[PDB]
Design an enzyme around this catalytic site. Structure first.
Site, PDB file in Angstrom:
ATOM      1  N   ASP A  98       0.837  -1.195   0.000  1.00 45.69           N
ATOM      2  CA  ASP A  98       0.000   0.000   0.000  1.00 45.69           C
ATOM      3  C   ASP A  98       0.887   1.266   0.000  1.00 45.69           C
ATOM      4  O   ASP A  98       1.866   1.329   0.770  1.00 45.69           O
ATOM      5  CB  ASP A  98      -0.879  -0.061   1.224  1.00 45.69           C
ATOM      6  CG  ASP A  98      -1.746   1.128   1.360  1.00 45.69           C
ATOM      7  OD1 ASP A  98      -2.871   1.106   0.794  1.00 45.69           O
ATOM      8  OD2 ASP A  98      -1.320   2.051   2.095  1.00 45.69           O
ATOM      9  N   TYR A 152       3.022   9.993   0.405  1.00 39.89           N
ATOM     10  CA  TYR A 152       4.069   9.265   1.113  1.00 39.89           C
ATOM     11  C   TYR A 152       5.452   9.643   0.593  1.00 39.89           C
ATOM     12  O   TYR A 152       6.422   9.675   1.349  1.00 39.89           O
ATOM     13  CB  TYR A 152       3.853   7.756   0.983  1.00 39.89           C
ATOM     14  CG  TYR A 152       2.622   7.250   1.701  1.00 39.89           C
ATOM     15  CD1 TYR A 152       1.850   8.100   2.480  1.00 39.89           C
ATOM     16  CD2 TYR A 152       2.231   5.921   1.596  1.00 39.89           C
ATOM     17  CE1 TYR A 152       0.723   7.643   3.137  1.00 39.89           C
ATOM     18  CE2 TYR A 152       1.106   5.454   2.249  1.00 39.89           C
ATOM     19  CZ  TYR A 152       0.356   6.319   3.019  1.00 39.89           C
ATOM     20  OH  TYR A 152      -0.765   5.860   3.671  1.00 39.89           O
ATOM     21  N   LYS A 196      -2.836   6.391  -3.808  1.00 39.02           N
ATOM     22  CA  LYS A 196      -3.916   7.261  -3.349  1.00 39.02           C
ATOM     23  C   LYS A 196      -3.647   8.656  -3.841  1.00 39.02           C
ATOM     24  O   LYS A 196      -2.518   9.151  -3.794  1.00 39.02           O
ATOM     25  CB  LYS A 196      -3.917   7.331  -1.801  1.00 39.02           C
ATOM     26  CG  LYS A 196      -4.144   6.007  -1.161  1.00 39.02           C
ATOM     27  CD  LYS A 196      -4.046   6.076   0.385  1.00 39.02           C
ATOM     28  CE  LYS A 196      -3.830   4.674   0.991  1.00 39.02           C
ATOM     29  NZ  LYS A 196      -2.336   4.628   1.435  1.00 39.02           N
ATOM     30  N   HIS A 255      -7.482   9.817  -0.925  1.00 39.05           N
ATOM     31  CA  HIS A 255      -6.748   9.672   0.328  1.00 39.05           C
ATOM     32  C   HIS A 255      -7.538  10.181   1.570  1.00 39.05           C
ATOM     33  O   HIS A 255      -7.559   9.522   2.632  1.00 39.05           O
ATOM     34  CB  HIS A 255      -5.381  10.344   0.201  1.00 39.05           C
ATOM     35  CG  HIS A 255      -4.412   9.921   1.262  1.00 39.05           C
ATOM     36  ND1 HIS A 255      -3.091   9.672   0.996  1.00 39.05           N
ATOM     37  CD2 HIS A 255      -4.583   9.683   2.585  1.00 39.05           C
ATOM     38  CE1 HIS A 255      -2.480   9.313   2.116  1.00 39.05           C
ATOM     39  NE2 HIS A 255      -3.358   9.338   3.104  1.00 39.05           N
ATOM     40  N   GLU A 298       7.396 -11.976  10.928  1.00 37.89           N
ATOM     41  CA  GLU A 298       6.556 -12.467  11.997  1.00 37.89           C
ATOM     42  C   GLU A 298       5.097 -12.213  11.651  1.00 37.89           C
ATOM     43  O   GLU A 298       4.250 -13.059  11.918  1.00 37.89           O
ATOM     44  CB  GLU A 298       6.901 -11.825  13.358  1.00 37.89           C
ATOM     45  CG  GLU A 298       5.856 -12.096  14.500  1.00 37.89           C
ATOM     46  CD  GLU A 298       6.131 -11.349  15.796  1.00 37.89           C
ATOM     47  OE1 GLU A 298       5.287 -10.510  16.194  1.00 37.89           O
ATOM     48  OE2 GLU A 298       7.190 -11.565  16.425  1.00 37.89           O
TER      49      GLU A 298
HETATM   50  N1  NDP Z   1      -5.100   5.712   4.535  1.00 38.39           N
HETATM   51  C1  NDP Z   1      -4.470   6.515   5.364  1.00 38.39           C
HETATM   52  O1  NDP Z   1      -4.824   7.678   5.556  1.00 38.39           O
HETATM   53  C2  NDP Z   1      -3.249   5.979   6.003  1.00 38.39           C
HETATM   54  C3  NDP Z   1      -2.626   4.805   5.552  1.00 38.39           C
HETATM   55  N2  NDP Z   1      -1.477   4.343   6.111  1.00 38.39           N
HETATM   56  C4  NDP Z   1      -0.874   3.084   5.615  1.00 38.39           C
HETATM   57  O2  NDP Z   1      -0.790   2.135   6.688  1.00 38.39           O
HETATM   58  C5  NDP Z   1       0.465   1.455   6.679  1.00 38.39           C
HETATM   59  C6  NDP Z   1       0.750   0.893   8.071  1.00 38.39           C
HETATM   60  O3  NDP Z   1       1.150   1.950   8.939  1.00 38.39           O
HETATM   61  P1  NDP Z   1       0.508   2.221  10.400  1.00 38.39           P
HETATM   62  O4  NDP Z   1      -0.943   2.022  10.387  1.00 38.39           O
HETATM   63  O5  NDP Z   1       1.016   3.605  10.759  1.00 38.39           O
HETATM   64  O6  NDP Z   1       1.399   1.182  11.245  1.00 38.39           O
HETATM   65  P2  NDP Z   1       0.882  -0.181  11.887  1.00 38.39           P
HETATM   66  O7  NDP Z   1      -0.285   0.127  12.776  1.00 38.39           O
HETATM   67  O8  NDP Z   1       0.733  -1.189  10.783  1.00 38.39           O
HETATM   68  O9  NDP Z   1       2.116  -0.678  12.773  1.00 38.39           O
HETATM   69  C7  NDP Z   1       2.297   0.101  13.970  1.00 38.39           C
HETATM   70  C8  NDP Z   1       3.637  -0.242  14.611  1.00 38.39           C
HETATM   71  O10 NDP Z   1       3.717  -1.619  14.897  1.00 38.39           O
HETATM   72  C9  NDP Z   1       5.080  -2.014  14.944  1.00 38.39           C
HETATM   73  N3  NDP Z   1       5.137  -3.451  14.612  1.00 38.39           N
HETATM   74  C10 NDP Z   1       4.905  -4.008  13.411  1.00 38.39           C
HETATM   75  N4  NDP Z   1       5.022  -5.349  13.472  1.00 38.39           N
HETATM   76  C11 NDP Z   1       5.285  -5.648  14.769  1.00 38.39           C
HETATM   77  C12 NDP Z   1       5.504  -6.869  15.419  1.00 38.39           C
HETATM   78  N5  NDP Z   1       5.440  -8.074  14.739  1.00 38.39           N
HETATM   79  N6  NDP Z   1       5.772  -6.804  16.758  1.00 38.39           N
HETATM   80  C13 NDP Z   1       5.825  -5.626  17.398  1.00 38.39           C
HETATM   81  N7  NDP Z   1       5.632  -4.438  16.804  1.00 38.39           N
HETATM   82  C14 NDP Z   1       5.371  -4.437  15.465  1.00 38.39           C
HETATM   83  C15 NDP Z   1       5.813  -1.091  14.001  1.00 38.39           C
HETATM   84  O11 NDP Z   1       6.994  -0.650  14.679  1.00 38.39           O
HETATM   85  P3  NDP Z   1       8.473  -1.079  14.261  1.00 38.39           P
HETATM   86  O12 NDP Z   1       8.695  -0.418  12.922  1.00 38.39           O
HETATM   87  O13 NDP Z   1       9.278  -0.507  15.414  1.00 38.39           O
HETATM   88  O14 NDP Z   1       8.668  -2.539  14.116  1.00 38.39           O
HETATM   89  C16 NDP Z   1       4.863   0.067  13.776  1.00 38.39           C
HETATM   90  O15 NDP Z   1       5.394   1.348  14.207  1.00 38.39           O
HETATM   91  C17 NDP Z   1       1.333   2.566   6.162  1.00 38.39           C
HETATM   92  O16 NDP Z   1       2.625   2.108   5.837  1.00 38.39           O
HETATM   93  C18 NDP Z   1       0.521   3.115   5.009  1.00 38.39           C
HETATM   94  O17 NDP Z   1       0.414   2.133   3.971  1.00 38.39           O
HETATM   95  C19 NDP Z   1      -0.921   5.020   7.136  1.00 38.39           C
HETATM   96  C20 NDP Z   1      -1.547   6.147   7.665  1.00 38.39           C
HETATM   97  C21 NDP Z   1      -2.692   6.672   7.087  1.00 38.39           C
END
Ligand code: NDP
Length: 323
Positions: free
Chosen positions: A50, A55, A84, A117, A279
């Site tokens: 995505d 971005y 988007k 978006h 994971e």
């Molecule tokens: N439509 C919209 O308006 C929006 C869309 N998005 C989209 O959503 C995607 C996901 O982002 P977002 O929702 O912010 O992040 P997520 O909620 O998917 O993940 C949140 C956090 O979880 C941590 N994490 C991931 N896997 C694990 C694991 N196995 N164990 C422990 N911690 C974990 C990551 O930290 P770490 O990196 O430290 O591992 C990350 O900071 C974006 O990349 C983008 O595609 C984002 C915002 C807005």
């Protein structure tokens, strides 16, 4: 992209993998980081990526996907790529040109999915967040239903296979579906969704209209400065997720992810660390019982990590409504 994936079927007949890797990054990261993480996700078995024009990672995400195609790891037809169109280009005459731009960054012929978006238009220009002297975004007024028709035009141009929305509320989804001469319903509404904000009502509503809900913030969001209140609670430190993870022999993350899968939701995820990315793919391996699902339904607390606060005064801020 054919039926031999863990996929659901969109209302236009196309298939979408239910687990997607997100390509947005914390502010602190170089944008090349997205090339690195995409290569990792592809090797871990991700097929759905995505992205968004705003971005500013699509060129690096495209390098990564294209090198995996070139070297024989995947085929383009087995990749599902989303972009988007950003607030600055919601005007009908700017929508297609923005998609053409992303395709050029990507060096793709088409994207599989193209979303609005946010339902809020900003002053058009190269600047993604046009502001005045008070540091406040410059809103613009757009006919969202005219934006929708330009999307439909992008689908009939072959530039995108499917079209959907992100961060629409119930009323805003209705607008579109009730639009006279509508040609394609949005296939999805991509919205924040996690145990603290479980979206039961909008989920039920999207289901009733054959709209797939695609969840971000499944893991509590990357907490981006400044979109996210740095003093909101960290989702994955929530005791009951820790409790349930022990019970099932997983982690808090996998429990969060599986919770959404069992609800019929398509789930996004980002991690900057390789071993998490590997994971998150274990989501397919285990089932949460239905009493445990009800436990997680109970965490609902209206905790919205990304309220798009910088948009608050917009005629169309989607988050005032209950859902
Ligand atoms: N439509 C919209 O308006 C929006 C869309 N998005 C989209 O959503 C995607 C996901 O982002 P977002 O929702 O912010 O992040 P997520 O909620 O998917 O993940 C949140 C956090 O979880 C941590 N994490 C991931 N896997 C694990 C694991 N196995 N164990 C422990 N911690 C974990 C990551 O930290 P770490 O990196 O430290 O591992 C990350 O900071 C974006 O990349 C983008 O595609 C984002 C915002 C807005």
């Amino acid at each position: 992209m054919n039926s031999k994936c863990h996929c659901v079927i969109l209302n236009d007949g196309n298939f979408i993998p239910v687990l997607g890797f997100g390509t947005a990054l914390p502010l602190e990261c170089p944008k090349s980081k997205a090339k690195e993480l995409t290569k990792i996700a592809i090797d871990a078995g991700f097929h759905h990526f995505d992205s968004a024009s705003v971005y500013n990672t699509e060129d690096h995400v495209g390098e990564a996907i294209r090198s995996k195609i070139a070297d024989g790891t995947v085929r383009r037809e087995d990749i599902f790529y989303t972009s988007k169109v950003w607030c600055t280009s919601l005007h009908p005459e700017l929508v297609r040109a923005s998609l053409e731009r992303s395709l050029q960054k990507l060096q793709f012929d088409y994207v599989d999915l193209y979303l609005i978006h946010y339902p809020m238009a900003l002053k058009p220009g190269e600047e993604n967040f046009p502001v005045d002297e008070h540091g406040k975004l410059i809103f613009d007024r757009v006919d969202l239903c005219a934006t929708w028709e330009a999307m439909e035009k992008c689908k009939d141009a072959g530039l995108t296979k499917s079209i959907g929305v992100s961060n629409f509320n119930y009323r805003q989804l209705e607008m579109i579906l009730n639009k006279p001469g509508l040609k394609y319903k949005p296939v999805c509404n991509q919205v924040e969704c996690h145990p603290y904000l479980n979206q039961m009502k909008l989920l039920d509503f999207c289901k009733s209209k054959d709209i797939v809900l695609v969840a971000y913030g499944v893991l509590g969001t990357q907490r981006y400065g400044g979109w996210v209140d740095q003093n909101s609670p960290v989702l994955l430190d929530e005791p009951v997720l820790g409790s349930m993870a022990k019970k099932y022999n997983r982690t808090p993350a996998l429990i969060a992810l599986r919770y959404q899968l069992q609800r019929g939701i398509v789930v996004l995820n980002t991690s900057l660390k390789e071993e998490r990315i590997k994971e998150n793919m274990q989501v397919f391996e285990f089932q949460l019982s239905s009493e445990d699902m009800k436990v997680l339904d109970g965490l609902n607390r209206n905790m919205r990590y990304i309220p798009a606060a910088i948009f608050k005064g917009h005629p169309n801020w989607p988050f005032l409504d209950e859902y």
